[PDB]
Amino acid sequence: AFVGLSDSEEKLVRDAWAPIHGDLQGTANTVFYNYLKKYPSNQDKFETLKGHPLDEVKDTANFKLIAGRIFTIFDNCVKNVGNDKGFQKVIADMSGPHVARPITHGSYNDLRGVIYDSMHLDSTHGAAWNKMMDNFFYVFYECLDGRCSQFS
Ligand code: HEM
């Protein structure tokens, strides 16, 4: 389900993300590398990376484009944490190209964990961060299964 956050929880989310916000491309490159290294089955999902050793593709503009675009979305969700409909819209618009793509909830959840582990959050910030991410994944999965118009 979608469960709204308090203004304190909204604030904890912004604070949690702030080191990443100030280094979005850098952090994105590292997390995306770490995700494809830990969960290598996912690399084939990207036609542009398919068939290359990960270490050969990690320094390409294209790899960094892919990693950066993920982080831009989360940046925009964090910016919209206080606006349910605007947070939902960010997700709705990015969900479209993932629809009917053969990516499991497991592969998405695996990326979520790599992001989490990278942030080294204390439990107060982690709790607020997980409320936001639970909302993100609720919206995202509803949209993947053709129930996106509900958030309009
Ligand atoms: C859950 C966090 C994610 C976010 C915020 C995100 C975001 C985006 C964005 C903004 C785009 C660009 C427009 C588009 O083509 O959709 C995109 C495309 C794409 N997404 Fe993701 N995505 C996520 C997860 C994933 C995962 C885990 C996979 C694969 C195991 C994946 C596979 C793809 C592929 C294959 C494309 C097109 C690739 C290209 O040729 O450049 N996405 N995504």
From TrEMBL:
Disulfide bonds join C143-C148. Keywords: Heme, Iron, Metal-binding, Oxygen transport, Transport. Heme b 6 binds at H98. One of its GO terms (molecular function) is oxygen binding. Heme b 5 binds at H98, R101. Heme b 3 binds at H98. Heme b 1 binds at T48, H98, R101. Gene3D superfamilies: Globins (1.10.490.10). Heme b 2 binds at R69, H98. Heme b 4 binds at R69, H98. It comes from the Eukaryota. The keyword Calcium does not apply. InterPro entries: Globin, Globin-like_sf, Globin/Proto, Mb-like_M. Residues 4-152 form the Globin domain. Belongs to the globin family. This is Hemoglobin V. It comes from Tokunagayusurika akamusi. The lineage of its organism: Eukaryota, Metazoa, Ecdysozoa, Arthropoda, Hexapoda.
